[PDB]
């Protein structure tokens, strides 16, 4: 279930506060209650997986928070807003978004999203 991935496999682990799963068209597949990645925000993310020009210099927006880009490649885009941040990992057909707060070890949030991506690819996603 897409809802389960988000609730249980991401948020449920406590390494991430809010999580969403998107489509390469930037449309949300499932989201944690109260977390909202807009289409517009979504289409920008996807786009950056292709060309990270925009994003590398201007940062990006996820549900009202503007993050500055720490890392951007074909598989991973990392955002940081002070002691907070977001880990996005593009899979074959989807994009994982794992937002974390100052109460979470960044190293841990990244390792959890990155590993769920690995498991999801292996399933055909």
From Swiss-Prot:
Superkingdom to which the source organism belongs: Eukaryota
Broad class of the protein's primary localization: cytoplasm
SUPFAM superfamilies reported for this sequence: Profilin (actin-binding protein)
InterPro entries, sorted: PFN (IPR048278), PFN_euk (IPR005455), PFN_sf (IPR036140), Profilin_CS (IPR027310)
GO molecular function, one term: actin monomer binding
This protein's record includes keyword Cytoplasm: yes
N6,N6,N6-trimethyllysine PTM sites in chain numbering: 103
Protein localization: Cytoplasm, Cytoskeleton
Region (Actin binding): 1-35
GO terms (BP aspect): actin cytoskeleton organization
UniProt GO cellular component terms: actin cytoskeleton; cell cortex
UniProt-annotated site: Actin binding, residues: 115
Key words, A-Z: Actin-binding, Cytoplasm, Cytoskeleton, Methylation
Family under the similarity heading: Belongs to the profilin family.
Subunit description: Occurs in many kinds of cells as a complex with monomeric actin in a 1:1 ratio.
Role this protein plays: Binds to actin and affects the structure of the cytoskeleton. At high concentrations, profilin prevents the polymerization of actin, whereas it enhances it at low concentrations. By binding to PIP2, it inhibits the formation of IP3 and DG.
Name used for this protein in its record: Profilin-1A
